[PDB]
Design a protein around this ligand. Structure first.
Ligand SMILES: CCCc1ccc(S(=O)(=O)Nc2cccc(-n3ncc(C(=O)O)c3C3CC3)c2)cc1
Length: 288
């Protein structure tokens, strides 16, 4: 695509902002708000359409977990509702495989989901698949070689360094090598042949460390850390570079945006969001 879209988030309350960043010229764009404010959501893209999944509206009028799926069309600058998931999923992970959207984990009140479900846009229908082996909220999710990985999170009692992989043709979950660090609410994405896990919360401190899982060697390896410790961040990939947006560093809701270049193994600050916020959903698609 061309732009990095950030949707929703949290600062004092849940937010409805949809803002698009252009790495080519540095410009931010404010776009049509979400119909319902929501933090802890996840974003993804299918067929050029942006999708916001799950989350939670923390508002003075109350707190409502979201089972909602909403579709933004850059061509029209409009949000359309889609079929809702089987359950509310706050602090959700999502991954796209073969044009289908996998919703992973999340919480519904004090319920910490291990359930997983799949959305087929061509039929506007969700269907439950095999549940993970672990309850995970604040779970990182990524797709590599058409395999779905759930990384870290919180299972209702402990933050996790564990990770697992879902094989669709077998409808099966299997544990993989655990991370060297406990991370909940981390940013997880894919670059080349590696699953990157960045930041998060280990139970005591917000993390700036970053590690990556090589699916061939089945090993986790730390890389250069981010400039800012940060949890509940948005993460995406643009032109073979990782972008991490916002988060919470234990003192401030960050408007910082960092960019990781894997050839030099260096992070650099590339811009600031229009305001500090955590728990955004992030994806990449064409300009509107
Ligand atoms: C002082 C207030 C701190 C705060 C931070 C984030 C959010 S938020 O609105 O961005 N919510 C959200 C989003 C994505 C993940 C998570 N998440 N999930 C599990 C855990 C954990 O700590 O174990 C976390 C926590 C570590 C992030 C939560 C609201 C408030």
């Amino acid at each position: 695509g061309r732009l990095i879209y950030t949707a929703g988030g949290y600062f004092r309350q849940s937010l409805s902002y949809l803002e698009a960043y252009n790495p080519s010229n540095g410009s931010w764009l404010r776009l049509a708000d979400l119909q319902v404010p929501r933090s802890g959501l996840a974003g993804c893209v299918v067929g050029g359409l942006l999708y916001a999944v799950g989350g939670r509206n923390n508002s003075p009028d109350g707190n409502t977990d979201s089972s909602a799926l909403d579709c933004y069309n850059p061509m029209t600058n409009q949000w359309s509702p889609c079929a809702s998931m089987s359950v509310p999923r706050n602090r959700i992970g999502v991954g796209v495989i073969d044009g289908h959207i996998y919703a992973v984990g999340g919480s519904h009140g004090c319920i910490h989901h291990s359930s997983v479900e799949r959305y087929e846009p061509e039929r506007d229908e969700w269907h439950l698949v095999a549940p993970m082996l672990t309850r995970r909220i604040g779970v990182g999710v990524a797709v590599l070689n058409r395999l779905l990985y759930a990384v870290g999170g919180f299972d209702g009692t402990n933050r996790l360094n564990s990770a697992e992989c879902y094989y669709p043709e077998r409808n099966e979950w299997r544990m993989i090598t655990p991370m060297n660090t406990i991370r909940s609410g981390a940013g997880v994405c894919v670059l080349h042949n590696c699953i990157y896990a960045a930041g998060g919360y280990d139970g005591q401190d917000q993390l700036n460390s970053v590690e990556r899982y090589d699916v061939e060697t089945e090993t986790w390896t730390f890389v250069a850390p981010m400039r800012h410790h940060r949890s509940a961040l948005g993460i995406t990939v643009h032109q073979g570079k990782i972008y991490v947006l916002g988060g919470y560093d234990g003192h401030t809701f960050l408007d910082s945006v960092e960019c990781y270049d894997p050839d030099s193994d260096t992070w650099s600050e590339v811009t600031r969001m229009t305001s500090g916020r955590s728990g955004v959903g992030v994806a990449v698609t064409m300009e509107p």
